[PDB]
């Protein structure tokens, strides 16, 4: 098992490797091979071209053997130029061929994570800001992309070139030259890395200061009115200036450190250049080496170290990318709380009854909320679930949609345990109008059609009619194509709730849940929407979970929960007669509204 | 001056005073040092190939192995030391200059910030924090990258190109000079024209990326709804198609980069081939040494290495200039509301407020006030109410002189507020707005904001007067509790109380409640009305309210209709007149009944 290993960068890359080498595409595998061949050709070319340069010099200094020297030197000089162009060509061709491979690999990693995030449990509560999340994901995407690019097209070719240069130097020079360049690379890498760590820290500080300065400016600009009201212009200006100065100081330190790293690198490289060139000319003095050799060695070294100029950045980036990618994999690795059983059958709703059978549940194991809740909702009946603050009624919908499983007990629809069926068929049987309904960032027509996968214009028109939102949409300039949500037209609470009702209407489920559906509405809006809800509950099993009893007073039967159990059951009149928990609650709510009516 | 072509040149010419300040002698010295480092660095990079040529020359002359080894050693060593020295000079110019760069861009930002504060409210500064922050981040990065590329890439390259032209001229060709000149011209032209297309492809890729990402985020943030409609596969597919569109666009963009690079390499390498071949030919005739070959080669490579990333540089410099131009446009934008020359301070001895035949609208095609006149006696509690066309929402903004009347005038005490300093005027005014805003800071910072040097005692007093003091006492950090986001979040009543407290710290003779209770629930409204009444004690108070019952206890009530004063008087006088106020009153009462009926 690959996961049975140390949690380092090597493990992350090993995990990513199947995406690059899919074994499902074969089109991409060919692209990978071709890209690797462009790498090899590009390297062969850049290694070859200095020899062409060396020989051109040799022909000019030892015209004795290669004549007409002019002809020989011309041929080699042209070979060198053509070689240079060829190296660039091979390199860009490998980039181009690979880019599809990279984009595909990362797209699939993203897709896998997205699917997994949809499979994970609600308790992670993905209720956060769009901007924060988007900035984070943007940042991570740029990071993983940069890491992948530097890895494949900078580090890898450089290892190829470094080994090649080592072999060639070995056969043809020194070999003290080999040890010298190897020690030089080792010093260069070690220096770059240790300096880069410090630099990354300064970078983080600088970035934090920048954010602080920017936030002060933005808080001021968005609150221009308040700054005017209190004549606070100078105060705001000063307040920005101090932060701006802190940032500038940090930035100065950060860029200064860049200069130190550059100087260190150039010092190492140039010591090696001096040593190698001196050694080469000295070797020439003894008739051991040609003068082309000087040119050869110099060129080979500059070609070697040119990709390593960036190494600090490359390092910082590769590291961050690896971290970010490990995070991807961690999510993919996190286990799924609610899963279908193996070979789970579909739920088959012939008669849409709902049973709670001795249900024990809580969100967390240290706080049990339902303590053995049992009840039967008859097929086609309209029932309400009410209770005081500790009843556990807010769990019901989430249990029914199997966002969570009971600790003990079970829930049945039409005699089938909902834990043992496919989640999709189960959810297919259920409609919900929640308290706060959320709209996608898209058109109102899209938001209504969302109830069913292939929803037609006719179906949407029908639902919007049944939701009595059809006219409101007709009066919109752009109609069903009116964009809604944030960054879109703002809808009133009743309008949004109507879109939600319409949505479930498009769904057309046998069982429907009103989950505090009117609880966030004003009184008149509530009274308006209740008649619509009454209509849409027509021939379905309807469970209405409500705070305000008067809104559910017309139910076929009412389930009264107290302390995570069924305390009271019956019609509104039966419950008023029993003079128990429901009656008390009723009385209290009546009193409240009277008091509210008093204040005029 | 500004009377110029308005190209990159004008933007840069404007920016030069920031780089060469005339207020900071130290930064001016830093600029001189940086320029010296540019000149040393260039001199070094031009010199070091000559050291190389001669080392080659020594090994070719070169008759035997006698004193050449020493000379060749000396010259290779000079070459290596030259390389290192050039880098050292380059980083030293960067290090020396960086402070100049940081200060210049800081002062430019500071100027834009200050002008934005002087500019009109009408610049509709209602936006999302993330968007504005994103735009400013992008722009700062833009101007920075631009400034760096301009100073430390383009300029040294111009120096080097001229130097290379002169040197090639004196020592070669001059077919070599023209050949390199043509090489650069073709190189730049090609890079530019390809880059324009590339920037377009980049923009497409970015919109596509934004769309895919938006789809994913909208899905994840709506996990509940997606579960409710069993819509996971659908969202997955929705993301996948967007993701593919993006990937395709990215591939096109990078392909175009490959094409630009290949074209560039074609130009560079043709020039290389030609120069070196011609040099070898000259050598064959003894006109040129063989060191000359390397010399030529090194010069050309050194020349073209900065022009490797010219595309990016170009794109960047372009965008930077655009963004900087934008900055300058704001600084240039004219200020709608200004103090008159030598404007006296406003002096409030008796805090009356007069509207004298005020004609106003936010835009000249929609007139809102049609000649509004009224008098508010010093120390009275007055309310301003009206039906939908009254123009009452203008009053506060007019009184604080966010705008001037098209016609007519506003007086405080006896003085036209258009002829006094804006600061003295706003110092006499306190406001509690409908939506009260908290800065992202402590509660104490937020209350103390009312007066510039406000003490903790003053904050305590204001918070006491606003009756929010107990609430703060029960906070662990008390007045040092952070609020806003991410800070402790306050109820509407708590926020309105902080707003009241802020105004108490100002302690103004004139206080405006501008739909102050409009966003509050009923109980909160009733609670805060006693605090508001108490806080009105020895000030002139003007309350603009939608709901008449909240202002029925006023000294006098001004009723506006169609931008003029329709009716005036006490609540009872107005009910007796059986006019507009009475009707409104009846209607609201009926409405309150209806809600209570249901
Ligand atoms: C907090 C980490 C959660 C991230 C997982 C979400 C995966 C889908 C988003 C990938 C977007 C790819 N992009 C930006 C190139 O379009
Ligand atoms: C699969 C390619 C696109 C995936 C998007 C990148 C994810 C963002 C990084 C997640 C968390 C980063 N970290 C470790 C700094 O917290
Ligand atoms: C509508 C956009 C307004 C742009 C003008 C605002 C300039 C204020 C300074 C913010 C710069 C922050 N910085 C430099 C520290 O990153
Ligand atoms: C340290 C840098 C301070 C300089 C201020 C830069 C803020 C740039 C905002 C530019 C926005 C212009 N626009 C509309 C073209 O996007």
Written description of the protein model:
The structure is a homodimer. By secondary structure, the first copy, chain A, is an alpha/beta fold. Chain A folds into two domains: 1-342, ABC transporter transmembrane region fold (Up-down Bundle), CATH 1.20.1560; 343-600, 3-Layer(aba) Sandwich (Rossmann fold). Chain A is 62% helix and 9% strand. The first copy, chain A, has helices at 9-20, 27-61, 69-119, 130-172, 176-222, 224-229, 233-285, 292-305, 311-333, 396-400, 423-428, 444-449, 457-466, 470-474, 493-507, 523-536, 572-578, 581-598; strands at 354-361, 370-377, 382-386, 408-413, 416-417, 430-434, 511-515, 541-545, 557-562, 565-570. In chain A, strands 6-7-8-3-9-10 form a six-stranded mixed β-sheet. Chain A is elongated, with a radius of gyration of 36 Å. The first copy, chain A, starts with 8 loop residues before the first helix and ends with a helix. In chain A, 38% of the residues are buried. Chains A and B meet through helix 2, helix 3, helix 4, helix 5 and helix 6 of A and helix 2, helix 3, helix 4, helix 5 and helix 6 of B. The complex binds lauryl dimethylamine-N-oxide (LDA) (4 copies). It is classed as transport protein. Keywords: Substrate exporter, heavy metal resistance. The assembly is dimeric.
